[PDB]
Amino acid sequence: KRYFPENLEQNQSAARLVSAVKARASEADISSIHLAIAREVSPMFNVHE
Amino acid sequence: LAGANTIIAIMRLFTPQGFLRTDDLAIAANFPRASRNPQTYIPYTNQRGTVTNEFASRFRTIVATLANVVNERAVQDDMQKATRSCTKQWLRHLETQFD
Amino acid sequence: MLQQPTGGYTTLEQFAFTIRNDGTNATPTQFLQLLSYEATENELVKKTIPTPETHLPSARNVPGNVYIEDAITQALFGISAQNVNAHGYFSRLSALALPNTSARLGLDGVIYNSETINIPFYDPAAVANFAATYAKLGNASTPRYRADMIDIYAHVGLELAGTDAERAAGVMPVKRAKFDSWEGSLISLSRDVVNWKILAFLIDLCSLEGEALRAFKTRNRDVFRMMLFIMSTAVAANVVNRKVTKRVDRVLEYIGVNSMRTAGRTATITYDLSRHEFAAKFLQLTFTRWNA
Amino acid sequence: NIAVAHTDHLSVVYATMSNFMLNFTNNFSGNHATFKPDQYVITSPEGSYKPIIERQGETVDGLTIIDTSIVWPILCQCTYPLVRQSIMEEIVYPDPSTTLSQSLSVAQVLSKLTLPDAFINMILSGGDSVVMRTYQTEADDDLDEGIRMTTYDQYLSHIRERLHITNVPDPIYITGASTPDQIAASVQATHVAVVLYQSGVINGPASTYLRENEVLVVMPDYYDVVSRFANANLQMNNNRYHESVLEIADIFDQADFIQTSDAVRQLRALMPTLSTSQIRHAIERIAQITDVDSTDYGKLTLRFLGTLTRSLKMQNAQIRRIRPDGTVLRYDDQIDIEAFRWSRYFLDELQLRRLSVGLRLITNPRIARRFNGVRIMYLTDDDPDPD
Amino acid sequence: DKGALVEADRVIQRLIPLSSSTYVQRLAAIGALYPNEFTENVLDLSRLSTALLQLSDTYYQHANDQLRRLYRRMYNDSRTLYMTQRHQELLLAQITADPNILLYPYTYIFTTIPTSMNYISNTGQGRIKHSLTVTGATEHDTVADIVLGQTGEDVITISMVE
């Protein structure tokens, strides 16, 4: 993962921001990504939420 | 809008950066297509420049706006002041990663 | 000894001053023809130049044959001269200043301590006339004798950019110079000028009198202006290029203004503060001789 | 007791240490009420700026954490040479050469450190570019001829920061009341053929000027472009244009800022399309080539400096003060030092002077020995000649 | 200008900004133009800088284009000491008297004292009570409506009867 600049992850005053980015940074999964890209073109029948 | 300009200007950060391709190959194949003028919005064009890449540059202006906005964010807590600073660094970092 | 003609030494084809340009050895006047100007709101009023100090610096006891022409030319237009006041060898000119001195000034621009075989030299009376003033380049460093390095540049601009009307008036808008330009035009110009035998032009400036001198000032005004141009690029606050329909116009801004800049740039030769003092002194002496 | 050893003996050490080569920044004016350190950044037009000074959380092996308790041992359990009670220990005056030699070692290691990246960035400095429609305004216009123009967003994204660096007044807006002379004035004032459209419609002579001088108009949008002009020819049309790339080198030509020698130009023409990762790989390769072992203290400073990640985007990078408010200021004679006015691509003056002659080598015809294109033809080889 | 004898130490009491920020250059430029009318009213000396900066902000805001360009020249050559011809005449007098005297060299004499109205300046307390005249030099062919922003009662009250 390359979410943070070097040192900023281990910086003590950054911990709120780092906790936040960790709260949003889902682990990469080929199925989820391939789907995320593929779905951009695929027809949608049930409205997405 | 007359007085929501920071809001509108941030909303422009959402404007899509690609183009509306016509589905010429599929119209040629007589593939099924419910629209009478088939089209799909491709997310981004390829880099016609030799070095500059329009997409990374747009994200540069986006992170520029967002860092200016994080910086213009007043807070009470000391820790909120701290993260207000650290987020600007993280923004700048995402900018390079996106490039 | 080379005799001095009824004109100056400059009348000899051996001493002709030319800058390379568009594949040929162009005369300075036909470079200055390329020059065009942009007036700005700022104005330049020339004040009277203070008279040069009476006092001639002593030459020290120097055994060698000091290379005074290379020293002066590199001090003014040199691409990488520095600390020009440190060695203090310009004072050596004073050795020439005396009546019946045993020293001679070579056409090479070397000051020999005695006459030597197979080395041609300027007529000693004329050289005494030249040394009698220009040895004062020797005191460019010494605090009691320093030239102004701001106001004098007004005169530079006036003698460069100035129209005959602006010149008679003694005031001109602070003009911004420009010319159609080849790559590195200013450096190559500065190096064409560094090879100039300026001692010839100065000797004729200091020794010629009356009608011959006035004819000299008219004949050599463009050469003078060329040196002034190189110096003005040395002091110019900035030197940009401008794209213009498959052409590039070099632009220096501004003429007549000394920015006193010391940090170097690739565009032009740069003056260490010592070079600023030296150039100011040189301009004082030279403009003083040029207006009489 | 210790007051003498401070006022009379530490004060000198603070003064000589004040003079050392590496203590380059000012530290404190001594007035707590209004002190603020000057804050330079390495700004880039093509990236976010890097402050020299920030709370980066690199504590430097714990150095940046301050134990005030150090006053207790200092006052109350440490002897000083100046306070004997009286042995009269002789004072030590350290050899300058040690601290001098480590200072110098750090310096040379630093220049040689920057060098490979700084070279490539100079080669590609003209390579940043803006997309540009060229609408044609004549019956027989070539695809290049016409009225050059670019979207305002491209202009902010590239041209503007470079104007701020070149320190020229911002280009005029053109309200359609504009004379060609006003435009000529702005162009010669900002040394760049760029003007910002504000309100229509631009008149005939102004159009002939923008076309003939190839001045680049900057539109807010392309929403109805021809309505923004006044074509007496009725030649101009919203569908009639040619989009194309405009290298920054084809706009700017400031000497130490944007390398633009025709040599470097054609050398770029030889290059493949590049990513920032490609450029980074090139820089790493030149680094891999030119690596040379340093003096041992220089190897120590290199090891202590940490991994050379170099996340910084250095395309046309400068050194500018930022306001505490965070805006990056234009260079100011009267405040900023002359050395910061141009990076000079971060090279030594001699590397520039040599670079010149090298550009002269590269474009020598005798070297140009990569040949382009072949003719297949069925012929006898009677009396062969390469030519 | 009133011709009275002056025992002051120097003819030009204004500072020359040898090196300064923008605000100083503009303060000096507007300062050398002598816009202010003579005023015996006590000033609030404390707010002075702000006042003068506002004056630059007004002088540049409403001067004819040549005056405007003159202030811009002044703002660019800040190291110059601009001065009226009479001032320089006084300097030539004191140099003629005491040749050894040093004087700041980089001056620009005014061949013309600029033609502009003097600005009123009373920074002391007291509301003005203008006695407006029905007609004047200006001809307003068509003026935009002026909307007076509403007043607090803290700044002014309006009782039913005096």
From Swiss-Prot, chain A:
Protein name listed in UniProt: Inner capsid protein VP1
Subunit-structure text: Homodecamer; each decamer is made up of two conformers of VP2, called VP2A and VP2B. 12 homodecamers assemble to form an icosahedral capsid.
Residues of the full protein shown: 446 to 494 of 1333
Recorded family membership: Belongs to the turreted BTV-fold inner capsid family.
Function of the molecule: Inner capsid protein that self-assembles to form an icosahedral capsid with a T=2 symmetry, which consists of 120 copies of VP2, with channels at each of its five-fold vertices. This capsid constitutes the innermost concentric layer of the viral mature particle.
Subcellular location: Virion
The species this protein was found in: Bombyx mori cytoplasmic polyhedrosis virus (BmCPV)
From Swiss-Prot, chain B:
Subcellular location(s) of the protein: Virion
Purpose of the protein: Inner capsid protein that self-assembles to form an icosahedral capsid with a T=2 symmetry, which consists of 120 copies of VP2, with channels at each of its five-fold vertices. This capsid constitutes the innermost concentric layer of the viral mature particle.
Oligomer and partners: Homodecamer; each decamer is made up of two conformers of VP2, called VP2A and VP2B. 12 homodecamers assemble to form an icosahedral capsid.
Family, similarity comment: Belongs to the turreted BTV-fold inner capsid family.
Record's protein name: Inner capsid protein VP1
Species in which this protein is naturally found: Bombyx mori cytoplasmic polyhedrosis virus (BmCPV)
